[PDB]
Design an enzyme around this catalytic site. Structure first.
Site, mmCIF file in Angstrom:
data_model
loop_
_atom_site.group_PDB
_atom_site.id
_atom_site.type_symbol
_atom_site.label_atom_id
_atom_site.label_comp_id
_atom_site.label_asym_id
_atom_site.label_seq_id
_atom_site.Cartn_x
_atom_site.Cartn_y
_atom_site.Cartn_z
ATOM 1 N N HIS A 47 0.788 -1.623 -0.371
ATOM 2 C CA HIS A 47 -0.311 0.209 0.239
ATOM 3 C C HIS A 47 0.683 0.848 0.035
ATOM 4 O O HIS A 47 0.439 2.061 -0.713
ATOM 5 C CB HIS A 47 -0.826 -0.084 1.145
ATOM 6 C CG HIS A 47 -1.390 1.414 1.792
ATOM 7 N ND1 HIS A 47 -1.722 1.961 1.891
ATOM 8 C CD2 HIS A 47 -3.264 1.428 0.183
ATOM 9 C CE1 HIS A 47 -3.075 3.214 1.806
ATOM 10 N NE2 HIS A 47 -3.399 2.244 0.826
ATOM 11 N N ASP A 89 -6.546 2.315 -1.970
ATOM 12 C CA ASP A 89 -6.735 1.908 -1.015
ATOM 13 C C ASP A 89 -7.902 0.237 -0.883
ATOM 14 O O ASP A 89 -7.807 -0.464 -0.090
ATOM 15 C CB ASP A 89 -7.304 2.816 -0.020
ATOM 16 C CG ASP A 89 -6.849 3.944 0.016
ATOM 17 O OD1 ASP A 89 -5.968 3.952 0.018
ATOM 18 O OD2 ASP A 89 -8.023 4.788 -0.259
HETATM 19 C C1 LIG Z 1 -1.589 5.414 10.966
HETATM 20 C C2 LIG Z 1 -3.320 5.861 9.915
HETATM 21 C C3 LIG Z 1 -3.460 5.622 9.023
HETATM 22 C C4 LIG Z 1 -4.290 4.572 9.531
HETATM 23 C C5 LIG Z 1 -4.713 4.305 8.074
HETATM 24 C C6 LIG Z 1 -4.989 1.881 8.430
HETATM 25 C C7 LIG Z 1 -3.998 1.621 7.952
HETATM 26 C C8 LIG Z 1 -3.818 1.129 6.124
HETATM 27 C C9 LIG Z 1 -2.079 0.891 5.948
HETATM 28 C C10 LIG Z 1 -1.120 0.576 5.028
HETATM 29 C C11 LIG Z 1 0.244 1.195 5.740
HETATM 30 C C12 LIG Z 1 0.290 2.340 4.772
HETATM 31 O O1 LIG Z 1 0.314 2.568 3.772
HETATM 32 O O2 LIG Z 1 1.252 2.836 5.702
#
Ligand SMILES: CCCCCCCCCCCC(=O)O
Ligand SMILES: CCCCCCCCCCCC(=O)O
Lengths: 122, 122
Positions: A47, A89
């Site tokens: 991601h 996402d």
């Molecule tokens: C730190 C707050 C961000 C919360 C979003 C949910 C986590 C998604 C994880 C993907 C990791 C990234 O791209 O950082």
């Protein structure tokens, strides 16, 4: 669009982003150094890499809408950025779901100073 | 607006939000059950409470502009939301700086299930 990313995570994993994924392993919720601890951590790594392909966009703040078609996330196209942010996402939410069977609670609050590796190219 | 908040944090504490404040104690980066662990943690609870005074806004995604006059943060006023959101972020960044000297590395990755107190009103 942290808001939309959160809604996706909720719908797909049944877990609330905080605290289950906000600081998971070496990459969920932040982190550049690995190696990733597991499949869930690899999802987050992917991601971060995806967001790297959006230098012309503001992934964390650009709002967008999405639909669910036959159980699948369907991204909107009002703008190029919203479309690409949404796809990034969408990918992570689905990846987190697919690896729920290996979700490790001892990685939920993984201390980041345990992530020593170099910053590996995507 | 998490973007502006992060910039203020760096400017005031000399630390980037991640990993220093993204999951510190019972309230930094999220959390509801307390009690707060320390002065830094109380800064985050007060920040959360401040955002609760902006139900007409989207504090995590609404972008805003600010300046630094005489070492002080000067919030913009294009909209009421940009102004009020900016004042909440300004307040927490300054509070984190004021309490830098008692920051406790052992609370940086505090497991949230250890926060067992009631959810106190703001
Ligand atoms: C730190 C707050 C961000 C919360 C979003 C949910 C986590 C998604 C994880 C993907 C990791 C990234 O791209 O950082
Ligand atoms: C979890 C990603 C948020 C990163 C911003 C740094 C934390 C700011 C602390 C304020 C705590 C709060 O209101 O959650």
């Amino acid at each position: 669009s942290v808001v939309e990313l959160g809604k996706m995570i909720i719908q797909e994993t049944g877990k609330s982003p905080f605290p289950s994924y906000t600081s998971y392993g070496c990459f969920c919720g932040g982190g550049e150094r690995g190696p990733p601890l597991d499949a869930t951590d690899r999802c987050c790594l992917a991601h971060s890499c995806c967001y790297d392909t959006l230098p012309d966009c503001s992934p964390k703040t650009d709002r967008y809408k999405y639909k669910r078609e036959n159980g699948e996330i369907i991204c909107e196209n009002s703008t190029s950025c919203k479309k690409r942010i949404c796809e990034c996402d969408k990918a992570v939410a689905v990846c987190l779901r697919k690896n729920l069977n290996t979700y490790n609670k001892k990685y939920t609050y993984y201390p980041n100073f345990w992530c020593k590796g170099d910053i590996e190219k995507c």
